[PDB]
Nucleic acid binder design. Structure first.
Lengths: 226, 82, 108, 98, 94, 226, 96, 81, 94, 107
DNA sequence: CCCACATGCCCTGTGTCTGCAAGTACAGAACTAGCCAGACAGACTGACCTATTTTTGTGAGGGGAATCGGGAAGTATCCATTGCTAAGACTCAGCAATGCTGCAACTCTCAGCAACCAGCTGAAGATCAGCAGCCGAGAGGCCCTGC
DNA sequence: GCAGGGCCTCTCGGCTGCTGATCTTCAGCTGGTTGCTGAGAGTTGCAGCATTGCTGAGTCTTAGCAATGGATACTTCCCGATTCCCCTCACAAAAATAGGTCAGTCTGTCTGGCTAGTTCTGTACTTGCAGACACAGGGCATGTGGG
């Protein structure tokens, strides 16, 4: 039902500007904020900012102010992000994802991604890479920098696909996620546990905190199966 | 069965008749899509509460009484069906 | 002693006993006084009598010998106090009051 | 030369005709299909009483007629006789729906 | 069946008392039933709220009279209060 | 609080038209109808018609249609009455009086009257004139023609003053009327009883029915004290 | 001498009064009006110090909410000056 | 006895109410209309408040009575009980 | 002189658990008490109406959950249902 | 045995016992279930926690260490769902949201 | 200003048809008559908290004079809606088959009430330091006028 | 578009007050435990009613056209609103004081809920019948396009 359509790859000359849409459908457009995430292989996922279509309110990351500017179009149910003065360190995949105004809620639905190429609290994931069989138990830790009151989420990203939400509020299962995945912990120590594995469970797992104004993702954990 | 795109069954002359009963003499051409959207929003809001009542009563059939309660809790009391 | 209805005792046509039972079984108070159902029946009977009489007058003015939702709606909407009482109430098959804005009529 | 009524005459005729009757102005089968299509998004394999569908139709048509009355008032305020989506939005937003 | 228990016969008695020659249809009967139920619920809820505000546990004719005053507009309240007082006095006189 | 102002006497040429105001105050102007009553020594009080300010609805006596025309002005809370083609049989005092839309209510407040001079159910009052002492009991009868279901009122008119309501619904006391006056009867037989008399009870007592569309007053009963 | 063009001081006052929370009607006049109105229903009445305050907050909130709709109607009619006809239209659409 | 205190709602006060309402230009006939609507609102609320205070067999109107009077008209007020 | 019985000590505990360092004023305290009372009455009345409609005599967590679903909008209802279900499950285990 | 509050049993801060007593003495139904007060206490606590957290964030943005009716009003009015829930509610000394129409602004 | 001919919607008619009004068994709820025990009423009493007062200093409101700028009335174009035709088409109203669901009407246990008890929670009421309001002097923002 | 002279805030800072977060004590409401019973679950089996299909007669939608009217732009004027200054007058804050009200505690009664019995009123079903819907036609207001 909920879909967040985006545009295709954008080849762009350095020094110019690019604007991409985040047309949304299947839900009340004004009741959910639209957050924007950039992903580079150098530094993984990074949070740019969000726009609240209800009152056109925005909030940007400290390091992304000026570079990015967010606008909303309530008539067409579309949200744009504009990047100005495109530097060489701007070639990445930009994801727009939906998030409710509730402090407990997280990024539940994402866009397929827009590949743009130009011609605080640190969250530490202890296992950088892991290997396991088809019926084993694995566990990922997301040791935090400061105290976040259970405001942590877990995402699963298949290769060249948008992330999928598994856990929110550090313990609650997402919509449609099987009971195999189970999160735990509060404060500064968090954990993700996958009960019995499959060939499908091969992906990279991220942990995101939204307890304070700049949202920070985890380093990532590439999981190998057999 | 799966229904698809039935908001267009509220035809242009039907909206015209509703406007005429409302006392409207001249109707713009963009009024019809706006009216369809408004009607869809209203119907969704009413039917959600009606279905909530129906599933609380542990039934599979939506009743005129459930519709009446759904309308009444939105300040739109209807006389004639219970 | 032969049974005398409370409706007959109070001179009403609405059921004092049934109104008392509805007041008791409706979770309104811990206990219900003796005269509260009588007062409730009297007020309800007066209201329905007024509405029915106005509706019957409208039906007679329409050369009809039977009250219909159109006559009920006409009676309610042509009286300011009844309109204020039933402002947020929809009457099925009642229609609307004939009313056209002045600026929509031809000038000459 | 065939007879032709000037614009507005038939409009007032229809206003008088439809402000006097009590029938439902939307077709029953299209409205029922719309109701079932909307309800599919809440629970699958639902069933509706015919009286439930009729109650929904009466409520929807009363709501639309009242909204069109308010829209006509706003359009007349704007010194027009043509109702516009802006008048509909103004009426809905003053009513407290937007 | 389960004894739907409407107000139809009482409404017909009132109708035959005010307009002896006038009839009524089934749809108008249902609308009148809905009206009576709605007004009963309004006044009963207001009376219960009054009793709870005043820390009383019983609903009395004073509560019903105050609820009638609060809910009916203008002369409607005056005439309904007069009718209720008359009926209560007659019932008390047995 | 409730007061219905009118105009003074108006000398008028025959064949012309006259409009008199009935400016109202002290109440919600739109919730009450304004009825118009003409009084001649020849035929006593007569009913012309009323106007409902809430929906601008009128209803005229069959003998007064065309002769009289009623209009309302919601801005200044004023009701006007127009008499057209003024014939010599139009010299009277015209009263405007308030009456609620409730079928039980009657003419409670009246205007002082405007003296205009040009240069069915028959309701029978049994005693045409009566004499009584300072402390006796008197009874006036208002036998009706057809059946009126308790829709009868009683009025007291001091000489050169507007009528004052005493009884409505054939039994209910008016507002401020002492309990000495007591009405009774229903159907076709009605009675007014004044328990103990006073020197200020010398007036003419009328009875009015409003059970059918043309309202008809009683013939009158002149009561003399000592 | 310095003079601001018509509209600048008005916008400054809009920004000033949309930022504060104090009551905008004088307490003594509002209390006098409340007692005068109450005289029509019951003689020799009496009011708590907080009953009048609650009435004042309710009245001011109602007036601000009505002025917002009045401004909306004025803008709909392609003006910037609010008029009694906009007030009446706002009340009529609200259902008062 | 108090007479004609509706004029105590001065023109600057109505201007301040409009400013908080976001109104830029105010016509000269707005003030009488605002006084009228304020009087209607105050009468409607005070009637119910006095009805409550006289059902309670009291002769002092309380903030709770005012709150109930507002609440039964769809104007719920937070902060006075 | 008689146990006004507000919600102040509970709302202050919630405040100290969500924002440990900031306080609250008396006016905001009263506003929060009014909010809690209002929401309590709304949910309780809707649950009572549900029980009456379904011909029951007891108010259960199912009635409370349905009332919460009907009265709160969007994600508010979902998170409140989650919190209530979690609390009930924890209480059942004692 | 030692007394254990139902709030402690359910892990709540709101009084399950007081909520049960208010449900019983409020004339809502003939009987009250065991889990109904727990569910209501949980829902109420969640709602007040959400409102208080938003108000505290607003107060921190305003560089204040106390929550006032202005902060409560800002928090409620800046949220779509909270505004829908509290649309017909007046907050004393709460003010209004700063909002000027676009056409009123100078060129 | 006054005529059309042409059409609309209103009134009048008998033939028909469905829906309202009336008669019966029949069962379930209401009335009666005790009896019981509690919620509320009548007459105390302390005592807040409302109201009518006097005084003071200052902040707001009111009445004016002038000028800008917005709203109102008038014009002239154009684009967008109504009115109409005939052609397709989707709705309706009637029939009849099936599987589904919403009940009714009996069992029983398990949950909730009730009513007693002690003891721990939460209220009223003192006391106090820290945050928020104030004053005042200082920075940069934007407005207005001139160029 | 660009520069310079008021005056108007957000921003500091340092005080001073009063309002919040705290500790103390008690009085009353909650929990623990027992034992009881009545409500709601669980499972049968019935009758109803929602579904789906099929037909085919008719009314209602749609599309395309052509040509009137109304809406929206523009300009000009003039009217009614803003700003500002001054001055005066009402508000607010204060300390007070009295008489009126509200509320709290006891006590005695009358009125409400609870019970078990009996009958009579209300419902449900089934009936004939006539208010009102049909279609079919005279006869009148006003219609739009003449003259």
């Amino acid at each position: 039902e909920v879909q967040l359509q985006q545009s295709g790859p954008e080849l762009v000359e350095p020094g110019t500007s690019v604007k991409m849409p985040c047309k949304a459908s299947g839900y009340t457009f004004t009741s959910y904020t639209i957050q924007w995430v950039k992903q580079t292989p150098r530094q993984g996922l990074e949070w740019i900012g969000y726009i609240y279509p209800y009152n056109a309110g925005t909030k940007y990351n400290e390091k992304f102010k000026g570079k990015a500017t967010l606008t909303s179009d309530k008539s067409s149910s579309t949200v744009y992000m504009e990047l100005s003065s495109l530097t060489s360190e701007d070639s990445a995949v930009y994801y727009c994802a939906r998030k409710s105004s509730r402090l407990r809620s997280t990024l539940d639905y994402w866009g397929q991604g827009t590949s743009v190429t130009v011609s605080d609290i640190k969250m530490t994931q202890s296992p950088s890479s892991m290997h396991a069989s088809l019926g084993e138990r694995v566990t990922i830790t997301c040791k935090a920098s400061q105290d976040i009151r259970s405001y942590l989420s877990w995402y699963q990203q298949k290769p060249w696909k948008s992330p999928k939400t598994l856990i929110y509020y550090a313990t609650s299962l997402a919509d449609g996620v099987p009971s195999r995945f189970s999160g735990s912990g509060s404060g500064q120590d968090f954990s993700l546990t996958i009960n019995n594995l499959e060939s499908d469970d091969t992906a990279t797992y991220y942990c995101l905190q939204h307890g304070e104004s700049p949202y920070t993702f985890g380093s990532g954990t590439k999981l190998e199966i057999k | 069965k799966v229904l698809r795109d039935n908001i267009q069954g509220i035809t242009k002359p039907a909206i015209r008749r509703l406007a005429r009963r409302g006392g409207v003499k001249r109707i713009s051409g963009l009024i019809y899509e706006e009216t369809r959207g408004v009607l869809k929003v209203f119907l969704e809001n009413v039917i959600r509460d009606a279905v909530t009542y129906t599933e609380h009563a542990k039934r599979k059939t939506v009743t005129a009484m459930d519709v009446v309660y759904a309308l009444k809790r939105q300040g739109r009391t209807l006389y004639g069906f219970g | 002693a032969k049974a005398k209805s409370r409706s007959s005792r109070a001179g009403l046509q609405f059921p004092v006993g049934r109104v008392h039972r509805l007041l008791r079984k409706g979770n309104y108070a811990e206990r219900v006084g003796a005269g509260a159902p009588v007062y409730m029946a009297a007020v309800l009977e007066y209201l329905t009598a007024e509405i029915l009489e106005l509706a019957g007058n409208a039906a007679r003015d329409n050369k009809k010998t039977r009250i219909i939702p159109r006559h009920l709606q006409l009676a309610i909407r042509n009286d300011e106090e009844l309109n204020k009482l039933l402002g947020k109430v929809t009457i099925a098959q009642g229609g609307v009051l004939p009313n056209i804005q002045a600026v929509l009529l031809p000038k000459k | 030369k065939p007879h032709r009524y000037r614009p507005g005459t038939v409009a007032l005729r229809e206003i008088r005709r439809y402000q006097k009757s009590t029938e439902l102005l939307i077709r029953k089968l299209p409205f029922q299909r719309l109701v079932r299509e909307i309800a599919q998004d809440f629970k699958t394999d639902l069933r509706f009483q015919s009286s439930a569908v009729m109650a929904l139709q009466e409520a929807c048509e009363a709501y639309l007629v009242g909204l069109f009355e308010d829209t006509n008032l706003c359009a007349i305020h704007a010194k027009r006789v043509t109702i516009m989506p802006k008048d509909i939005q103004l009426a809905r937003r003053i009513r407290g729906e937007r | 069946r389960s004894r739907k228990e409407s107000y139809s016969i009482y409404v017909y008695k009132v109708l035959k008392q005010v307009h002896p020659d006038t009839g009524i249809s089934s749809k108008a009967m249902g609308i009148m039933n809905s009206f009576v139920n709605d007004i009963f619920e309004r006044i009963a809820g207001e009376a219960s709220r009054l009793a709870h505000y005043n820390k009383r546990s019983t609903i009395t004719s004073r509560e019903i009279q105050t609820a009638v005053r609060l809910l009916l507009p203008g002369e409607l309240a005056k005439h309904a209060v007069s009718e209720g007082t008359k009926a209560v006095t007659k019932y008390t006189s047995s």
